[PDB]
Amino acid sequence: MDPSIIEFIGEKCMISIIPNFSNEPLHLIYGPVGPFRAGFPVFVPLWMATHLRKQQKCRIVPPEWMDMDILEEIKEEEKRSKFFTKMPCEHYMVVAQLVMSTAPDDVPRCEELRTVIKDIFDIRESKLRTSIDAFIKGEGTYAKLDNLTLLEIHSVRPILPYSLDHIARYQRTATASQRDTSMLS
Amino acid sequence: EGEQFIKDIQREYVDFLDDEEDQGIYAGHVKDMIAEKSKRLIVNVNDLKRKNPQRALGLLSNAADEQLAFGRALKEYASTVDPGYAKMHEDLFVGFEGCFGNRHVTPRSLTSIYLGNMVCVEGIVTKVSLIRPKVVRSVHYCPNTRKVMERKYTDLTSFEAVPSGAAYPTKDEDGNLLETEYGLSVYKDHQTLTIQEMPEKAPAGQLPRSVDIVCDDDLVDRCKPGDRVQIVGSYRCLPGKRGSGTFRTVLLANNISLLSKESNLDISREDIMLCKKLAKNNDIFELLSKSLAPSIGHVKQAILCLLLGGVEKILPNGTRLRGDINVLLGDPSAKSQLLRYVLNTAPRAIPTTGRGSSGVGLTAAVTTDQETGERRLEAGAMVLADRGVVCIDEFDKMSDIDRTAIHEVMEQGRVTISKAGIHASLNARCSVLAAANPVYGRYDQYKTPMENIGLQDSLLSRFDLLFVMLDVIDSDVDQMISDHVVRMHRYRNPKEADSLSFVSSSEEKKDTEVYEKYDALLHGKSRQRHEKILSVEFMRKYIHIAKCMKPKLGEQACEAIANEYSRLRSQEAVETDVARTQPITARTLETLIRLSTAHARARMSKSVTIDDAHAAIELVQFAYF
Amino acid sequence: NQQDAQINLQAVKKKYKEFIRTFNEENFFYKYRDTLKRNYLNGRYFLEIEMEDLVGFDETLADKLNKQPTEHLEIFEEAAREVADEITAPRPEHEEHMHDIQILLSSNANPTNIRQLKSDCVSKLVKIAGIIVAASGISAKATRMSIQCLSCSTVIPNLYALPRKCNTEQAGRPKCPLDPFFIMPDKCKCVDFQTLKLQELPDFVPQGEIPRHLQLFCDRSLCERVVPGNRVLIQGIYSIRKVGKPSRRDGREKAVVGVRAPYMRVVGITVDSEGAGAISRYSNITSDEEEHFRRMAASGDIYERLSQSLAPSIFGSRDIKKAITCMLFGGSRKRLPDGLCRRGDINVLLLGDPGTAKSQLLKFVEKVPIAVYTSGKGSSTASVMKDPQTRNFVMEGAMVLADGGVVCIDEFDKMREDDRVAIHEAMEQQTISIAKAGITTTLNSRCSVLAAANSIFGRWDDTKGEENIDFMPTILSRFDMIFIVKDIHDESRDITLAKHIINVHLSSNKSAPSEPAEGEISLSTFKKYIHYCRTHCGPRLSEAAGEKLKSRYVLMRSGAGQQEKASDKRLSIPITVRQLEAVIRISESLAKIRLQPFATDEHVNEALRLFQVSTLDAAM
DNA sequence: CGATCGAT
DNA sequence: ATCGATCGTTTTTTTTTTTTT
């Protein structure tokens, strides 16, 4: 649970970009890498366009969920998503930050875009407060992930559970122990 | 009959009267089958939440007619149960009481919210005020036609609506007779007062604020201004507010808690039994001596009898005399802090200033457009201490105007007083203390006994004893007092072989580590006592019956008082004390009488003994001996 | 809705609405959304704003905001609730109901002065800086309500006309005219109202005149915000309550033409930072501050550095000053379940030859959280007035304004004794009593006091014996450390005083080379430091301190009595319980400074040597 | 108890 | 022009505290 530990998870994802070289002072890595030719797209992870664009080496383009209409309809679906909604790559909250740092040198509409991502982030989080507002009787066998994303859940993780053990010990002891007529601890 | 959830709510309260809870307890033998007829019933919300929380907290957010419906449904219930009490055709509001704790703000903090709520207050009884009746409805009559119509009237302070404004009818039909029958036309009781913060939580960088209260019939004037109080009621705000000019508040819908009595105590005839069991123990007087002043040498053996008021003595259509005791003596540094052992220890304890005009006992009754036609009235600062005692500081610094104004009712033990508007009189038969200083500090014994004080020698007969209070030490006692004073400094602060910490237990705890600040019992249990036998509450629980018992005279009093008064007036005016033998008079008898009267109440021995004689003389000689 | 300009809609339509969603910098802090939501979470219902963001956003609003702010600053409220209620939805299910909010304003533009608040400066936003006197209680106000006659929540622009027609007209032709309005406060609202106050500055035309002042107003969250006797920075607005020019001439012989009244309401009061201008009750202080505090407390070179904080232009009197500040901190109000609330605060005496800088010193002790100064002939009988509205007998009751602060005075000698006695007394029990008219309100407040004086016959009395005071020994009683002031001669001392003050008194001298001294800095810091350190620690003794202090007071009284006997006549001050009862508070002040709770007797040998000044003063 | 205001 | 039905209409108090010479 951190700001970068999840980029060891999130930042390894890929897009496809354009460089301005062909195959470099080295040609290519023994690896899934594609052949390098300028003026044409190439598929890369996104821990490198970072390294490259600021190394003044390349241009870059986004995925397609980075748009307007998808991010105008996902929200209104998500409104009455009593549980969850559409999930474009499922950690777009980390890709978008590491995108929108530099690339907005030439990305289009990098502001209304940000507006919507915040607009969706806050709401989904806030939903993830009120899920708690029904949890009765120790329901630690019933929960939601179904179209969850991860950048929201780690914002809760250490809080409840290191408590929830001794919290619902009084009732988790119930289906794990025995006593006389009254409830057990 | 507004929105029809009201009737659903009626029957939801009818659904209170199902089984053991209310069909068993709360309905039946509750006001009317017990017949004290307090239409204001006792509800506690918690059971209502345990049936209908929609009616528990639907009430404490809105109370438009849920109360009206409650009273309606109740009267219809008992109409089923008991038509005998069906002759009180009114609302019969209810309690909705409790020592619950939902929201219990100060008078300071009824703050722009809580409007339309049922909540708590605490504060001071103040401005206990005048009474009036109120209009309900008028049973008219027409001898012309023999027709008795009727008409009820409202206003906001009772419920929501307002009368369709008009006065009482005349020729209302066409010209027939409108004989207003009273007696059938009815009336409640009304009242109006205010409260202040029992203030000592107040920030005196700020102003302790005020509240607004209204009351009604069976709630009428239930304690006196000068006491401590908690109360729980509902809230409303009527006036214009720029639709025309701004806004104001009011409180009602309530029952009381006065929180300073003894009859408040769940009193059997057992508490008397504990007292009378231990009553025989003889040298308990000395325990009560070391009781009230445990934080200071020094007296209080005698001060008790002030603290007990006195004894009533009247003759067959002859006279009456005032029964109570009064004394005082001292350079600065435990005199000025032996007066707040009463303000906050015993009841009916109202200190005064030393600087006071037009209401030390006056009223002056100045008035400006009261709600009613009160042309002249206020109250004062003595009946607050009726049937007890009083404190002051800076007495010698008091005016010599009102000193004589003390002497009036002090010496009379009567009120025949007024501020020239109406002659007024009653029986306030009070005692008092104050403080004192020699005009120059360290002088009362070298130069003279008298005249280091410098005032009228008239009062010294009005009071009881010339007495002594000084401060010096020789070469030997200094370390004795040092160890006494250092017991004062340590038996008050908490927490008082190679390694002795790291004991099986430590200061590490859950919920009984330090309450405020702990104290010792070591060697004050060499003083074989207990914190309950030597305490506040069992002490005060032995207040009432010594005030109810009445220890009549023996017979051996007479020869002894004779011989001792004889020797007193013989040779008390000699041996270095002559100028402190000025006030001898035929007044030591009645004070001796109050003495043995009191002391015979401290064990309640409705009797008299020679030991009491020693007890009531020895202090008098100890004044100088 | 005349959509050409000044329209009801354009602002709210998107502009104000989107200003905040649009308010952006990376670091993803730089909005007012986070502050808003996190404020809401804790029942705040407000947020703070600038006035030079419009330059960050645009070039039009502000020169329109100043003109009709009364409307713009409620369009702000509406936009605020609609832009925030979308976030009140976690999904549509937890807006149990919306709620109303208050905006703030602030700037650093410039403070004005009351002498210019004029007919041009009206209905217009502003900035000033004054000082506070007293202000009202907390009455009431609301916004709308319903009436049974119409059953509509009565909606208003202004914060009354109530027209003719009945609206219980569905009675047939038998209607109810002539204004039958039954106000239904089941259906009304409730906001606050407090009437703040304002006096003008001490340098801005009081010169050949007196200072005027002004009264104020509030609505919702600026009650419980200002305690009086404080220095404010303000943004408010200058407007009226009534209206009219023509020959409906007012009253009986009033209003030649049209005079209506002044006041202001606040839109965004703030406070002052005269070093620590406003550090008296609240805490906007941060963890860096408290680290600073405790790490200076950790510094074991803080007290002697603080012996040099009031005298950066003053020479000498260092043994005199080792406890001139210990007065400030206060010890402990160690109260007990019985009456014995043993005396909390602390009191000091000083008197001697003039020409020794008593006045300036007490001015400075006022300077350095809360205090006042008069001296003789007159802060505070206490005041039972009679309200000119309604003629009720209220109590203004002004040691109340030292309810935790302190007091300083000279001129105990030079004022008569009709007014010494209530204050003779207050400072042994701290309970201001009252018994005069129909009230018995034993008020109270924790003040201390500093006592300077002037002996008639000067050092003559001080050479030989008993002419010390002219008035009484019962106020020789109440004080602990009591100081002669002489000006005994020495030419070295003379010359050193000479250049010491001239180097002060030359060209407004010490700007640069003054603070380069060690750590003797920022009386502002001391305001904050004091208002901290007193507000936490409640120390009391250690065991080893008690026996030696006890034995020391023993020997004190024995030596006083021996000087009584070594002269065959009383040669002593009264060895009181008050002397130990006060030196205990000197220990308490010391432990309050270093913050160590439990204090040892080496900590208080310093106390021993300081009240030894009083002992050897009244030694003769 | 006074003036406004409408029609006959 | 005349009459009648419309509109809108309200006033009552004495005395206590601190201050100055």
Ligand SMILES: Nc1ncnc2c1ncn2[C@@H]1O[C@H](COP(=O)(O)OP(=O)(O)OP(=O)(O)O)[C@@H](O)[C@H]1O
């Ligand atoms: N034996 C004692 N009992 C109670 N208090 C004591 C005792 N010895 C000392 N004290 C304390 O010492 C302090 C001395 O002040 P004290 O109250 O005597 O002044 P005072 O009596 O008001 O002076 P004055 O009589 O001139 O007004 C008090 O705070 C008191 O609590």
Ligand SMILES: Nc1ncnc2c1ncn2[C@@H]1O[C@H](COP(=O)(O)OP(=O)(O)OP(=O)(O)O)[C@@H](O)[C@H]1O
């Ligand atoms: N030792 C000194 N060092 C520096 N400045 C001094 C010193 N003594 C006096 N001064 C200056 O002289 C002036 C003294 O005036 P001040 O009002 O203190 O008189 P005072 O000492 O209070 O006499 P009194 O008590 O009789 O009024 C002050 O302005 C102060 O700055």
Ligand SMILES: Nc1ncnc2c1ncn2[C@@H]1O[C@H](COP(=O)(O)OP(=O)(O)O)[C@@H](O)[C@H]1O
């Ligand atoms: N000759 C007397 N007859 C009756 N009572 C007397 C007589 N001499 C003294 N007393 C006592 O004096 C009291 C009344 O005295 P009082 O007139 O108050 O004295 P003073 O004139 O000093 O005020 C009575 O209570 C009684 O106890």
